[PDB]
Design an enzyme around this catalytic site. Structure first.
Site, PDB file in Angstrom:
ATOM      1  N   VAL A  40       0.842  -1.231   0.000  1.00 11.61           N
ATOM      2  CA  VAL A  40       0.000   0.000   0.000  1.00 11.61           C
ATOM      3  C   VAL A  40       0.869   1.270   0.000  1.00 11.61           C
ATOM      4  CG1 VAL A  40      -1.971  -1.173   1.012  1.00 11.61           C
ATOM      5  CG2 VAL A  40      -0.285  -0.061   2.531  1.00 11.61           C
ATOM      6  N   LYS A  52       9.730  11.946  -4.220  1.00  8.27           N
ATOM      7  CA  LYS A  52       8.724  12.703  -3.442  1.00  8.27           C
ATOM      8  C   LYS A  52       9.281  14.100  -3.184  1.00  8.27           C
ATOM      9  CE  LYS A  52       6.339  13.041   1.003  1.00  8.27           C
ATOM     10  NZ  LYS A  52       6.513  12.722   2.438  1.00  8.27           N
ATOM     11  N   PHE A  94      13.062  19.995  13.956  1.00  2.47           N
ATOM     12  CA  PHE A  94      12.457  19.061  12.980  1.00  2.47           C
ATOM     13  C   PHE A  94      11.389  19.782  12.172  1.00  2.47           C
ATOM     14  CE2 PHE A  94       9.684  15.510  11.763  1.00  2.47           C
ATOM     15  CZ  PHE A  94      10.597  14.802  11.033  1.00  2.47           C
TER      16      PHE A  94
END
Lengths: 525, 523
Positions: free
Chosen positions: B46, B78, B459
Site C-alpha cells: 500500500v 517525493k 524538525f
C-alpha cells in the site's frame, strides 16, 4: 499608520551606542533615533561572534574598530588557581600530580569520531587510567598555541584559530557614538533627565531634561545602567536579585602598563582565583586591564583593593582604582509597555565568561526581530522577554557551576558557594554529564555557528564548554560513555584525532607569529 | 566485561531490520544480534512515503547507495505532500474543488528551503503582501520553485542524476524490509530465527532473560528490542508498560488500503504524495512505477468500515466487491516510557500517528540513533534510559501536535468528523507556536540539516508551519511589524520572488518527467 516614529535611548556607553548604531542600520532611516546622555580602560573581553553579529552588520571592518580601541586577540579564558588554596597570585600553584593549577576554556571546536565528541574518548582513557593528559592539552591545539603566546592569525592575516577580542570599552563606545552621529544622523542630546512623563496607560510619553527639553518618543530603550531609571524606577518593574546563585557583587579595577618586550602578550583572558572572588587580566598593547571581582560579604573594599594591589605589586599611591557595586540578576520582565531594557538596566552577571557585550547585542538583535508598532502586541513583548530570561538564566547557571564544582574550601567565600543550590536545569545537565553523555551537542561546524545568530543563540553553551569547566575543575563522569565499550574502530579513529591535535599544535607553534608581533603590525607600533 | 553480549529483536519489517542493520554497523561486531520473525505473507504493498534525511541518516551510514536500495523496492521520488480538498465541503474526490477566490483547493508542503532577506524568511514578505492586498498568489507558488516542478510532474534530478531540488522517497516498505534483512544476514552476521515467540521469560526484577519459540529454541539475550508492532508483545504485554491513547488529539484510528495499477504512459508520475480529504478522514496516494498505494485513514466513530471502504472505492472507481483491501485498526499515541528495564520499543510497538506527514520510518531511525547514542551496559544506568525516553516523548508529542493542527485549522464544518476535530484541545506547546505565528513572528527558524542532531532538534521549522497554516488559510493577525521599517529589505525580497519564478520556469523547461527518470533508474 501605527509605526514607531521616534525611539529615545536613555544612556550612552556600549549599551546606548550599540543600540543606536544597530537600530540605525535595522530601521533604514524610517525612524528618528535620539540618545539622551549626561556629558580608566579596565578592559573588556568578548566572544567570537561580536564581528559577525555586530560590526559586520554595520559594515565596519574588524581592523578599523580594533585600531580605535587598543584591541587585542583572545583564544580562551585561562583559569588560574581555581583548584588550590591560598592568597591571590598570578603564578599557578602546583597540584598533587605536579601539574600547574591552570585550565583553558577555548573557542576551538571539538572534533567528533563516530558522532561522539573527542571529550568522551579523552574521558574514557582518563577514567580507565590510560592517559595522564589534561582535557585542554589533549583536545585543543589552541592550548599549545596559547602556552607559546602565538597569535590566532599569521602576519599575512590568514586565520589559524577561532578568537575573540580584548578592548577598551570606553573607546568602543566613543567610536560607535561618532559612527551613529556622523554616519546615521542619530541625535545626541547631552543633558540630564529630570522626569519620566507617563500617560493614563503607564506608557512613557517623554523624558524631561534639566535644560527644559521634553523629548517625545514612541519607544524608549533603558540603557541607564544598574539604576534602571526607566524600567525599574518609572515602570516599577521589580528586579530579581540572584545572589542566591552568585555571591560576587563588587569589583576594583585599573589598567596596568605592561612590558610586552620582556613578557610577550598573552592571546587570552586570565581568571585568577582570589580568597574572596577572582581577578581578570585582559591584555591589550602596552597594558592589561585588570579587575578583582569579589563579594563584599567576605572582603571590605579596602581588603579587596589591598589584595588586588598585592597581586600585581601596584603602588597604591600611583594607581587610579575604579570601584563598582554590581546588581546581580535580571528584571522580572526586560520589556514593559513601551520601555525595553538593554545592558545593566536589564540584567547582569560578573564577567567570568565574558558575556556582557554579548547580552547587549543579543538583546538588540531580539529587539530588531520583535520590533513593535504603537499597538505593542503583547505577544511580541512576551516572546522578547522569554528570550532574555532564558539567555540570562542559562549563563547564570553556567557561571554558578564554576564556583559550585571548585574543590576549594580554604576561605569562607569558597565554602559559602557550596552551600548555595543549583537550579534544576543545571542539575539536569550535571546528571547527564555524570552518566558519560554529551551535554548540548553542537548542531553545526564553526562557520555556521559564529556566522548565524539563531544557531549560536539557541546552542550557546555546548558540550565543549561544559567539559572545559567541569573537567577543568576536576568533576568527571561516574564512568565512560557506555557506547564506547562496543566501538573499538571508533576509539582507533579518535587516536588519529588526538594525534592531529598534537601535530597541529606543533605546526602552528612553529609557524605563527607572537601575539606581540601581530599586535605591533595591526596597530603600526 | 559488563557489556551487553546479545541483543534480541522481536519482529521484522522496517522496524526490526532497520534496528538490526543499524546496530550491526554501530556495535562493530562486539554484540550478537538475533531477529525473531514469524514467516508472514506481505499484505498488498500500500506504499510508504518518507522525508529527505533517510539517505544521509540511514542508508549512507550502512554504505548502501541510494540507487541500489531504490531498485529493490520499486522506489519513486517525493518533493512534497499535496493536500487536496482540506478547505472545502463534500464527498471524497481526487480532483480539487474551487475556493471562493477561484484557486483549486490544493496546497503543497515541500522540502525546498525558504531563502531569507535581512534574516527574515521569504514566508514573511509573502504574508505581508497577502495581508496588505498586494498579492493574490498562494504561499507555495510564491515561495518554492518546487511547486512549479510538481505541477509539471517533472523529476527532482536530471537524467545525468545532477540534483535540481530536495526530495525524499516513495516505496514498498515490505521490499525495503526484505532488502535490509538480506543485507543484515549476509553482510553483518545477524541471525534470522524464522519462528513464532511462545513466551517471554523474565527474572524477579522484571528484566527479560529470553524469548521461547514454538520450535522450543530459547533465545537468551541481555537487551530486547520490541519491533512486534501495535501488540507491543514485550513493552506492553510482558513489561506491562501502559500505552497513552491520544485520541483526544487525533480522531482517526482505522485505514482501508490497496494498491492501484496506474497508466504512467497516459498520466505521467506525480513526484509527490497526495493527502485527499474525505468526509471522515483522508486518503493517501503514494505513486510508484506502474501503480500507486492508497489508503483511506478514518475515525470508526464517524464512518463504519463499510462506509469508509465504499467512499475509498468510489474515489478511484474500484469495485468494492472485486478489490483486495487491507483493513487496519490503529493504536494512536505512545507508551508512557519507550524503554523499560532491558526492553526498548521501536516502531509501532513504541508509538504511532497516522501517516499524514510521512514520519513513521523517521520515528524508527531516530529511535535507533538515540538507542546507539544511549547504548547501555548490563547496569542499565537509569540516567541513560531516562534521557532516551525524554527524546522519544518530545519527538512524538511535537509531531502529534503538528498533525492535530492540520485538522484543528481546517475550515471544514460539513460533517460530524470535521466539526468534532474543533471540540478537541490543542496542547500548550502548539497553542504557543500558533500565538507566535499569529503575531507575524517566525516559528522555529531553521546540506548540514539533512547532521542528525541538527534536524532532530529543529524538525518542524518555520517553512513547515507556514506550509500547513497558510495552506489551510490560517494567516498572521498582521504582517511582521519590523517589515514596516525595512523598505530596502522588502525590495531585496522582490528579487527572491523573481528568483523563485525564474528557477521554476527554467527547471520545468529543462527537467525530465518523473516517469522518464523512473524508467531510467529501474532499467
Amino acid at each position: 499608520d501605527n509605526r514607531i516614529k521616534t525611539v529615545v535611548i536613555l544612556g550612552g556607553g556600549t549599551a546606548g551606542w550599540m543600540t543606536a548604531a544597530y537600530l540605525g542600520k535595522a530601521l533604514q532611516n524610517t525612524v528618528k533615533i535620539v540618545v539622551l546622555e549626561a556629558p580608566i580602560g579596565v578592559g573588556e573581553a568578548t566572544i567570537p561572534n561580536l564581528q559577525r553579529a555586530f560590526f559586520d552588520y554595520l559594515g565596519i571592518p574588524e581592523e578599523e574598530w580594533m585600531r580605535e580601541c587598543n584591541a587585542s586577540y583572545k583564544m580562551a579564558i585561562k583559569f588560574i588557581n581555581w583548584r588550590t588554596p591560598g592568597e591571590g597570585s598570578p603564578d599557578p600553584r602546583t597540584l598533587d600530580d605536579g601539574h600547574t593549577d591552570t585550565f583553558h576554556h577555548p573557542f576551538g571546536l571539538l572534533p567528533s569520531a563516530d558522532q561522539i565528541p573527542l571529550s568522551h574518548y579523552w574521558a574514557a582513557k582518563r577514567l580507565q587510567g590510560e592517559t595522564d593528559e589534561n582535557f585542554d592539552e589533549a583536545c585543543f591545539a589552541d592550548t599549545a598555541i596559547m602556552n607559546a603566546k602565538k597569535a590566532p592569525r599569521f602576519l599575512d592575516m590568514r586565520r589559524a584559530t577561532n578568537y575573540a577580542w580584548h578592548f577598551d570599552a570606553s573607546k568602543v563606545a566613543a567610536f560607535l557614538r561618532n559612527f551613529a552621529v556622523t554616519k546615521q544622523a542619530v541625535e545626541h542630546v547631552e543633558d540630564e533627565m529630570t522626569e519620566v512623563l507617563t500617560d493614563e496607560r503607564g506608557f512613557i510619553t517623554a523624558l524631561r531634561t534639566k535644560s527644559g527639553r521634553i523629548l517625545q518618543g514612541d519607544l524608549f530603550v533603558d540603557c541607564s545602567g544598574f539604576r534602571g531609571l526607566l524600567i525599574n524606577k518609572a515602570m516599577e518593574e521589580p528586579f530579581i536579585d540572584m545572589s542566591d546563585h552568585l555571591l560576587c557583587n563588587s569589583a576594583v579595577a585599573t589598567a596596568v602598563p605592561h612590558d610586552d618586550e620582556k613578557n610577550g602578550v598573552e592571546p587570552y583572558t586570565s581568571s585568577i582565583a582570589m580568597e574572596a572572588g577572582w581577578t581578570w587580566k585582559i591584555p591589550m598593547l602596552g597594558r592589561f586591564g585588570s579587575g578583582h571581582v569579589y563579594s563584599d560579604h567576605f572582603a571590605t573594599q579596602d581588603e579587596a583593593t589591598l589584595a588586588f594591589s598585592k597581586l600585581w605589586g601596584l603602588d597604591p599611591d600611583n594607581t587610579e582604582f575604579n570601584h563598582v557595586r554590581f546588581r546581580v540578576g535580571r528584571n522580572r520582565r526586560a520589556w514593559v509597555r513601551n520601555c525595553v531594557s538593554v545592558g545593566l538596566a536589564s540584567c547582569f552577571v560578573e564577567p567570568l565568561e565574558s558575556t556582557g557585550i554579548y547580552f547587549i547585542y543579543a538583546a538588540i538583535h531580539m529587539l530588531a526581530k520583535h520590533f513593535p508598532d504603537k499597538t505593542f502586541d503583547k505577544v511580541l513583548v512576551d516572546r522578547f522577554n522569554r528570550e532574555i530570561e532564558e539567555m540570562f538564566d542559562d549563563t547564570r547557571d553556567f557561571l554558578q557551576a564554576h564556583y559550585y564544582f571548585s574543590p576549594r574550601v580554604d576561605t569562607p567565600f569558597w565554602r559559602a558557594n557550596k552551600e548555595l543550590k543549583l537550579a534544576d536545569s543545571i542539575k539536569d545537565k550535571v546528571e547527564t554529564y555524570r552518566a558519560g553523555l554529551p551535554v548540548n551537542l553542537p548542531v553545526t561546524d564553526e562557520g555556521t555557528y559564529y556566522g548565524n545568530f539563531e544557531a549560536e543563540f539557541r546552542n550557546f553553551w555546548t558540550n565543549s564548554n561544559y567539559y572545559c569547566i567541569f573537567a577543568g575543575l576536576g568533576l568527571m563522569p561516574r564512568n565512560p560513555l557506555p557506547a564506547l565499550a562496543y566501538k573499538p574502530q571508533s576509539i582507533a579513529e579518535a587516536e588519529l584525532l588526538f594525534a592531529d591535535v598534537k601535530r597541529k599544535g606543533d605546526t602552528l607553534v612553529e609557524s605563527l607569529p607572537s601575539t606581540y608581533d601581530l599586535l605591533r603590525q595591526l596597530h603600526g607600533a
